Amino acid sequence: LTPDQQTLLHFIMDSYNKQRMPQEITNKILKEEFSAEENFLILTEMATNHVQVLVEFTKKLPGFQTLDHEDQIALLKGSAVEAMFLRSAEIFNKKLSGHSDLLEERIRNSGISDEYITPMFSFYKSIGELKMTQEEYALLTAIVILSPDRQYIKDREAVEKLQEPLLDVLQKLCKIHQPENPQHFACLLGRLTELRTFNHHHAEMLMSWRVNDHKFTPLLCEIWD
Amino acid sequence: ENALLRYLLDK
Numbered sequence A: 001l002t003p004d005q006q007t008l009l010h011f012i013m014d015s016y017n018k019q020r021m022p023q024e025i026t027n028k029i030l031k032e033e034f035s036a037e038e039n040f041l042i043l044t045e046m047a048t049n050h051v052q053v054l055v056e057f058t059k060k061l062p063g064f065q066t067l068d069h070e071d072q073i074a075l076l077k078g079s080a081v082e083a084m085f086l087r088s089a090e091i092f093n094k095k096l097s098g099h100s101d102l103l104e105e106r107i108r109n110s111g112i113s114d115e116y117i118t119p120m121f122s123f124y125k126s127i128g129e130l131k132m133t134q135e136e137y138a139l140l141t142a143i144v145i146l147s148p149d150r151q152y153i154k155d156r157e158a159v160e161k162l163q164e165p166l167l168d169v170l171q172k173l174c175k176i177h178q179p180e181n182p183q184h185f186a187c188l189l190g191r192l193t194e195l196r197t198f199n200h201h202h203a204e205m206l207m208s209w210r211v212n213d214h215k216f217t218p219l220l221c222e223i224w225d
Numbered sequence B: 001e002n003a004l005l006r007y008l009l010d011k
């Protein structure tokens, strides 16, 4: 419904495909030896790159540049882990460039504990059967980044004033493309709680990695402390 | 203190 949603939606869809991952980074999932060392480095590169495309994508979300500035950093630092999941989920499920079956092994031998690899791909498979469209991936990303519930937020109501419209547009989209089962909107929103569970375990993977001398880029260090 | 995040939010 409404035309004003289209002015808000497609402009978000403008930003969601403005930048893909550079070919200079994706092609080494193929070209280079499958070492536990180089596996981690490639993943570091892509994670490094993805923080950049997210900051640009969020910088355009309507009303983001108007928020307080000590809170936008808390928005980014609290959502970067989860938004990287959505994009890599869209890659694994659509099987796009991402080199799915080869990227997954490079992930499976990067020093990650087995108790974190199992629930990770169970998520990947589960969110694949949802047969989600690109606009659903794009909005869910916007809603995750603009989460008023994040840690060290001061003006929590300000975030709600910009997350609320995008939530209504999305449920008004499970109106058109699926009128058969009204629960699809509640099924996409479950994923955002799934991602929160992962954000808990991700802090553990990080400390396990640097225990073992895994240097990150300066920017991942800043966004994960 | 959020040196690099603030730089990309202003580029």
Ligand SMILES: O=C(O)c1cc(F)c2nc(N3[C@@H]4CC[C@H]3C[C@@H](OCc3c(-c5ccccc5OC(F)(F)F)noc3C3CC3)C4)sc2c1
Pocket (backbone or CB within 6 Å): A019, A020, A021, A026, A040, A043, A044, A045, A046, A047, A050, A081, A084, A085, A087, A088, A091, A097, A098, A099, A103, A107, A110, A112, A120, A216
């Ligand atoms: O636009 C495209 O075409 C495109 C193609 C891709 F192929 C692709 N791939 C992506 N991504 C995201 C999340 C998994 C996959 C690889 C990166 O994550 C690496 C990572 C994570 C990580 C963070 C969140 C989720 C999974 C993660 O990796 C993990 F190993 F599974 F844990 N933590 O540390 C790290 C590296 C060591 C420092 C960024 S985005 C992306 C975009």
